[PDB]
Design a protein around this ligand. Structure first.
Ligand SMILES: Nc1ncnc2c1ncn2[C@@H]1O[C@H](COP(=O)(O)OP(=O)(O)OP(=O)(O)O)[C@@H](O)[C@H]1O
Ligand SMILES: Cc1cn([C@H]2C[C@H](O)[C@@H](COP(=O)(O)OP(=O)(O)OP(=O)(O)O)O2)c(=O)[nH]c1=O
Ligand SMILES: Cc1cn([C@H]2C[C@H](O)[C@@H](COP(=O)(O)OP(=O)(O)OP(=O)(O)O)O2)c(=O)[nH]c1=O
Ligand SMILES: [Mg+2]
Ligand SMILES: [Mg+2]
Ligand SMILES: [Mn+2]
Ligand SMILES: [Mn+2]
Ligand SMILES: [Mn+2]
Ligand SMILES: [Mn+2]
Lengths: 287, 683, 287, 683
């Protein structure tokens, strides 16, 4: 009942980072403190890693196991967006704002950062555990994918949105909003596929799947807290970002057909502002 | 935003549900009082102004010296006696931004409308003060409008050529191709549009000096011509414009058309060269019967028969070419080619279509040559003789290249003044003077043909404006009746003036004796048919004017037989693009494209309602795209029966019309006698 | 040396089925004979069936085994074009020209057809034989992929191009030309990835891989000749189609860095119509 | 695969770790026995063969009519008596694929090497049987190789011109530009390469008839010329090749150079036109001092001084131009321009570099004119005078264009036969005959300059081959000593032959009296310096050959003063690419690019070892890319001191070399007296 409308929405949302000129951010970037620039680079690098794996691994593997040519076409399109559009856009931003050495250093930093490695290990592990014709392993990977789309990106998205909302780094911010617009529909779509599998189960099996989903969310959440503190303490925003990731965790649960898990909190209003030819017949020669 | 622009923009601000057309008089008044009167160089008297203009290399002193200063002063007073007022902002804006003489720094206005008209009249009169006053009255009344080249450049030292239309025949040789490139660059340098006939060039894959598959075809020559026209861009303000014409039976016809496809490769695309196709009746006959047709390699025909393919009658020679083994040909689908032409005209508006048999069945100078191609505007249809440009130190065989200087009658003003005869004769005299004063130093065939043929083009404009301002639908039978009568009278009086000029000068045009004017075959329909209006409403429009009868045409035929004709060609209806604004007239004899013309000049947009547009006549100002193109074809064919040359005929097509509709329009135009089709404009 | 350049060319060629209005083809379709309509339907179904294998297996399997983030992104983009753009385009052409029952029957026929099946299963067999961390098996699959993209499609493309060059079925011919333009670049790109593997091999292993490629080409070519006669004899075109197959076989070989196998032939003209700065230091001026 | 090709491919198959060089003799023998003898037409006698060739429009009967058939038979026997055998497969393959006359269908072979040699000798002798035999001995011994045009076309009815290099001066006017395009097309139609000097054209943004910013500059003319050369691409058998030269001080220099940037837009990019830059010593001096330089608008200079910028002495007039307010100039960075030239040459090999002051400090005909540009191969350096082409029906002021017919001495064969004097004199006679029998009837300046200056180019080839086969390193001082002695002897004997021809004909070249030959300033270094070998090893190479001394040079100077000189220019070392295989020699005087040449002909790959290559001389056959370009510059400068024209000097660069290394090589060549640099080839 939904794939065709998602197909149409995905293809009509198609974009390339080159459509957005980035040289306009040069001055507002120059004006940020060293702490702010550091957090910003690292935040986008963490996002780049997530999209790299979502494009290389997550979306293609889910596409492989989901039945139906139209469902596969949507998932293939989403996969392309992840690595050919989203992951690449971050390099466009980096290449504009930062010198090569700072770019090299931040990519080295993703490799050695323990929270980013842990979250990649956990998410990609679940993708690679999918067994052919085994719907339960597929469900688990789809939960992981929804958590990546609708929860994990948001510790990263906070900062570009926070600046956009203050009228700073607005070209980079425009790119990020386009990425976010895509991930929102990706999270909903994968959520609907996960619910399909969940709804086939016995009540006992469903109870176990909810346990899996909630245990996984909590494990990812605890890691994301440490990641958030590590990045945002130097810019004074860790508590604010934490509220934002809890907000989005609830959206991820809802995409999976589950009740919200965290209590509602006031999000920084700045971040909220950041959001023809026919032949000639014989009679044609007579009048 | 200037005040006049603000007033003009108030046109579209509807008040009481109707456009505020009266804002244009206010707009033009404010424009004058606040820009033109301020920015007009002040001279104490006409003597000081003329001395300043001549001294500063503005006005040529050759034509002014023929008059005593009293005569010049009298002519200038005659120009100013009318108290001419531009009725709309656009007319005055166009004049004072394109034609009004401005200082070398382009900051001040040296010429008013009256000064320009007086200078043009003095140039025309060639020393005749009364003739100059008659020209001043003719132009100030706006009954006759000299073409943009003549009007802008007349009497100016920096002026370019007063003639702007050139047709060149290209012979099938490297020497001739190089000479054609050189002449095209030379004529573009003068600012005139140059049209070339490529039908004599051998097709791609023909042998050069018994070496097979060596020739590059007409497309390589077209690339050369495109580069030449791009280089001679006339300072770049107006990019160099050239047209290439190819016969439909040429082998390279498909490649010739492919140069205008958007999908075409850049090494084949010809950006700056317009393309026209010459379609004999044989091709239409082949497409009508769905028979398989052949395109011939021109050099094989030339070798077999010693004459060029486009110098022969295809309706008589097609079967012989097909049956001749020594003639090389490849099969084509005539209906597929017609569909390709329609598709190309829809996509880009090209190529121009010339119906060769429609042109040559009424051509008066077939003895000199048949009309093989047209010009860049598609209305010049004259006999041409190719030149033989030989090696250096070898004498060249100069042929005849076509050129004509243009003028337009203002139909509305000619009918209001009831001065068809006098206006036509004065326009013929001015065109003859322009032709006699032209001398092209790098186009030997152009200059020789100008001397020998004395061809002039007298067009008309404001047909739709006149009809709408008189409660007549453009497509209605009454409109065609008026056009028939008016253009019959124009042809009669232009022939009478040509014969009178031949009698006064004692000379006719070269090879006049073999023309249909000399034998009387031209006047058959005029001596046998009455062209008086058949509707009382139309007949009333001509009240006060004598409409020639069959007896008058018999007398004119006898007079021509006695004295001959000075001009080989007299009448051609050119587009008259930008000078129509100055005259506040609709363009040529075409129907108006828009009721109100919205244009952006600088960073301010301007609105130009069609002249005389009002609530009462709003419905009669029907736009061309809303018109039945069959009725437009009927009107143009009615006019064309009295024009010896062609008529620039633009097709106005809606986006919903298929290629079949365009093909049917072209087929109906060919059926109705239409000689050329200029452009396919889509809304 | 080449992936970013191909990325650029791929993304700038992006298009969607909806851009070409198909209905005006019915004005020439109605004038074709039964044999012409039959051949067209069968050719179209052949292309559709082969392209589906490439979208579901061929491109995604190669993307899975190739190392490099940028290569995976380009390959993902190509897989997207197969599934989201090409497959929808073929379906659109079919739905325009034939009623539902006729489409189902043509696909039933072509699905059972011996020559179509032989080539489809030969290609799919090589994709299924790729082994993790074995570059030889990957190379063999890449050869199969290049043969599909740059060679096997062309016995099919011939007919739409033949009509397109005559002014018939122009809307569907425009679509086919866009598809073909994508397959051309796909073939060139996968060819470069195969040459990279080939160049890492010993001389004996190279000779062995060359023998594999030529042997595979021979098997496919002999089946193409039979496929060609089966479809095109009824419309009298087989001789010219065979020239077009060999010409495209040579292009496929050149994509794999190999010499042409077949002598140069001219093609049907109707089908052709369808188709280190360093600065001077003030001492360089003295000697 | 052909059997001979399999035998040739066995060259690369190492046996005992050594190349099987003897396999090439087997390859050539198999090639002959299996293809050439089979496909060689059979004629019962020479009389029948000559009759068949004349009647079938293969040979020109006029030149063969000057000999009784007995003399023709004697000449052919002389050619055949040698029993010449091609030493390698590539020599015979190149001859029988490029120069051997074939039937009109290109199926059978009508000429062998002996037949072509005999026909060329009979054409040269112009009716002299003993002279024809001498020419046959010279060519069959391979001591002299006529240029590809002369060798291929001599004695053939359907032949192009025997001269293939032309230099055209272009005047600053539309007539001159159009005539230049026409002449370039006419000359490319003849197969010759055309070089055009664009330094007299005004720069972009100059006034055309007191209207400013009207000129398109040299880039628009470059686009015109590129399209003209593409159109006249020799019937497709060989794409039209042209060269454009611009002085570095021309304002359009940066736009001119940008036409060769890969990133250049297709509108500005020129694809088939080679570009060279003329660099006066003033530019090098400015770059050396890092001073800001100026590029001038040529038309402002012409108006201010009445002369063209390239007609004046830049070294003297640069400061005057900079200080003249009426001369428009643009500030530039000379070192940035030098680095741009280096980078453009690294990326594309362009532009050619002409060091104007190096050319003219030794130029013997500066009274006629300075040398302003070079040819398409950068070895032609002669005085030229620009023509003034006026409007049609006006008289053209025909100037002096440049053209020389080329021939190459085979250095190895000349030294082995100890026949420098005889070979040089016979080559001079043959080149004089070719010049005399040449008449271009569509290039008036070219024809006039050929008749007036009588310029010939006598080149040399197999310098590296001869040195390597004699155990001498190309970069060694001994190689430079040999080159000095050999080319001094060549110059001495060419001057002596020119003086003898002038005495025999009692006529010198136009304006000889003002030349350095007439005043004796040419012979200063020859009468004051000795050029005999300084190394005993090199001196032994000349054993049995008289090396002219200072006394000999004084006697030659006196003889020239008494009788004058027939040729304004005599010696120029052209690249000599295609015929080097037939001669079995290294191309020109350049070092070999590769010891064994790998070529693809069809689907068969052919292996060509350097002529004479073997295990014992492998080290001496050092590849050019591995040599020190400074040593190559030293060699070329040693040779250039005895050449009146230029030497086509290609630079062979490794990919690791930066633009700084290329600039250093260029600056050293300018320091060492190099005149032109042809190509920057990178490995
Ligand atoms: N529409 C117009 N077209 C041409 N010239 C105009 C126009 N309106 C004004 N002018 C020029 O500007 C001058 C001043 O215009 P304005 O209407 O104020 O004149 P006026 O004093 O009322 O009398 P008059 O109309 O006789 O000039 C006019 O004399 C005429 O020279
Ligand atoms: C010289 C040349 C001519 N052409 C074309 C242009 C001319 O229309 C046509 C004839 O060239 P011509 O200049 O007339 O050649 P020709 O007269 O010496 O040979 P022939 O008598 O056989 O014609 O060939 C080319 O396409 N490329 C070329 O290089
Ligand atoms: C006509 C023309 C000339 N030129 C350039 C090429 C010529 O080298 C240069 C001079 O053209 P000319 O043919 O010499 O024009 P002219 O002699 O009438 O003007 P002037 O008195 O100033 O010499 O202008 C263009 O770039 N575009 C053009 O359209
Ligand atoms: Mg000819
Ligand atoms: Mg001039
Ligand atoms: Mn993403
Ligand atoms: Mn996503
Ligand atoms: Mn596909
Ligand atoms: Mn594909």
């Amino acid at each position: 009942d939904f794939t065709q409308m998602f197909y149409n929405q995905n293809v009509k949302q198609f974009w390339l980072p080159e459509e957005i000129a980035l040289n306009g951010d040069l001055l507002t970037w120059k004006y940020l403190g060293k702490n702010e620039q550091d957090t910003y680079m690292k935040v986008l690098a963490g996002l780049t890693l997530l999209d790299t794996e979502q494009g290389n691994t997550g979306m293609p593997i889910v596409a492989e196991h989901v039945d139906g040519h139209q469902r596969k076409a949507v998932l293939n399109f989403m996969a392309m967006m992840e690595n050919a559009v989203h992951a690449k856009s971050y390099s466009n931003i980096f290449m504009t704002l930062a010198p090569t050495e700072t770019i090299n250093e931040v990519f080295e930093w993703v490799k050695q950062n323990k929270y980013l490695q842990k979250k990649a290990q956990m998410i990609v592990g679940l993708y690679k555990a999918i067994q052919k014709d085994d719907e339960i392993s597929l469900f688990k990977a789809m939960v992981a994918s929804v958590y990546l789309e609708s929860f994990l990106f948001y510790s990263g998205f906070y900062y570009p949105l926070y600046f956009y909302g203050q009228g700073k780094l607005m070209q980079s911010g425009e790119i990020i909003n386009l990425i976010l617009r895509d991930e929102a529909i990706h999270g909903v779509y994968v959520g609907l596929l996960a619910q399909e599998i969940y709804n086939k189960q016995t009540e006992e099996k469903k109870a176990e799947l909810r346990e899996f989903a909630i245990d996984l969310l909590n494990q990812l959440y605890e890691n994301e807290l440490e990641y958030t503190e590590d990045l945002y303490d130097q810019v004074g925003l860790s508590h604010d970002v934490k509220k934002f990731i809890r907000y989005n965790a609830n959206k991820a649960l809802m995409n999976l057909g589950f009740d919200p898990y965290f209590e509602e909190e006031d999000i920084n209003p700045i971040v909220l502002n950041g959001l023809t030819v026919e032949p000639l017949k014989d009679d044609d020669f007579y009048f | 935003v200037p005040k006049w622009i603000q007033l003009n923009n108030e046109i579209m601000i509807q008040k009481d549900g109707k456009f505020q057309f009266d804002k244009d008089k206010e707009a033009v008044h404010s424009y004058f009082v606040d820009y033109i009167n301020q920015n007009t160089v002040f001279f104490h008297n006409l003597k000081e102004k003329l001395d300043y203009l001549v001294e500063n290399q503005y006005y040529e002193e050759e034509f002014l010296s023929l008059y005593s200063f009293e005569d010049i002063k009298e002519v200038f007073k005659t120009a100013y006696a009318k108290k001419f007022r531009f009725p709309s902002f656009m007319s005055a804006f166009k004049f004072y931004n394109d034609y009004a003489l401005k200082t070398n720094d382009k900051k001040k206005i040296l010429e008013r409308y009256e000064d320009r008209i007086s200078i043009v009249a003095l140039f025309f009169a060639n020393g005749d003060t009364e003739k100059a006053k008659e020209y001043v009255n003719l132009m100030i009344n706006q009954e006759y409008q000299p073409s943009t080249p003549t009007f802008l450049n007349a009497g100016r030292k920096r002026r370019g050529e007063l003639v702007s239309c050139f047709l060149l025949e290209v012979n099938d040789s490297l020497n001739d191709i190089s000479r054609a490139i050189d002449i095209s660059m030379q004529l573009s340098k003068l600012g005139g549009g140059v049209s070339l006939n490529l039908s004599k060039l051998r097709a791609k894959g023909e042998a050069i000096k018994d070496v097979e598959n060596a020739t590059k075809g007409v497309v390589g020559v077209m690339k050369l011509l495109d580069n030449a026209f791009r280089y001679a861009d006339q300072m770049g303000q107006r990019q160099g414009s050239g047209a290439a014409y190819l016969n439909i039976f040429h082998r390279d016809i498909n490649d010739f058309l492919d140069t205008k496809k958007i999908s075409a490769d850049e090494d084949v695309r010809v950006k700056t060269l317009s393309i026209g196709v010459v379609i004999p009746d044989k091709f239409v006959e082949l497409a009508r019967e769905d028979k398989a047709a052949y395109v011939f390699y021109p050099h094989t025909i030339y070798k077999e028969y010693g004459q060029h393919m486009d110098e022969m009658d295809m309706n008589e020679m097609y079967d012989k070419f097909v049956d001749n083994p020594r003639v090389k040909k490849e099969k084509i689908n005539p209906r597929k080619l017609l569909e390709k032409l329609a598709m190309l005209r829809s996509e880009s508006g090209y190529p121009y279509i010339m119906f060769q048999d429609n042109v040559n069945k009424v051509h008066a100078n077939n003895h000199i040559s048949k009309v093989k191609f047209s010009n860049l505007c598609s209305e010049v249809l004259q006999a041409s003789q190719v030149s033989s440009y030989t090696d250096y130190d070898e004498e060249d065989e100069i042929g005849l290249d076509i050129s004509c200087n243009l003028g337009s009658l203002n139909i509305l003003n000619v009918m209001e003044h009831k001065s068809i005869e006098k206006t036509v004769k004065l326009a013929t005299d001015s065109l003859t003077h322009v032709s006699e004063t032209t001398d092209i130093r790098n186009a030997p065939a152009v200059r020789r043909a100008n001397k020998a043929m004395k061809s002039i083009g007298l067009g008309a404009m404001n047909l739709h404006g006149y009809l709408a301002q008189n409660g007549i639908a453009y497509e209605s039978p009454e409109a065609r009746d008026f056009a028939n009568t008016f253009f019959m009278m124009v042809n009669f009086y232009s022939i009478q003036r040509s014969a009178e000029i031949a009698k006064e000068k004692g000379e006719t045009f070269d090879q006049y004796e073999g023309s249909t004017y000399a034998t009387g075959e031209y006047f058959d329909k005029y001596v046998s048919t009455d062209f008086s209006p058949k509707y009382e409403k139309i007949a009333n429009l001509f009240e006060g004017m004598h409409i020639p009868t069959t007896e008058d045409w018999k007398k004119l035929k006898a007079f021509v037989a006695e004295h001959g004709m000075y001009h080989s060609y007299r009448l051609c209806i050119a587009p008259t693009g930008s000078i129509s604004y100055v005259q506040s007239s609709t363009a040529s004899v075409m129907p108006i494209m828009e009721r109100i013309e919205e244009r952006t000049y600088g960073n301010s947009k301007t609105y130009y309602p069609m002249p005389g547009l009002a609530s009462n006549n709003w419905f009669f100002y029907k736009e061309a795209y809303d018109m039945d193109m069959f009725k437009v074809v009927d009107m143009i064919a009615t006019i064309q029966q009295h024009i010896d040359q062609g008529i620039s005929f633009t097709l106005f097509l809606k986006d919903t019309m298929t290629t079949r509709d365009l093909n049917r329009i072209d087929l109906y135009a060919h059926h109705r006698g239409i000689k050329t089709i200029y452009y396919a404009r889509t809304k």
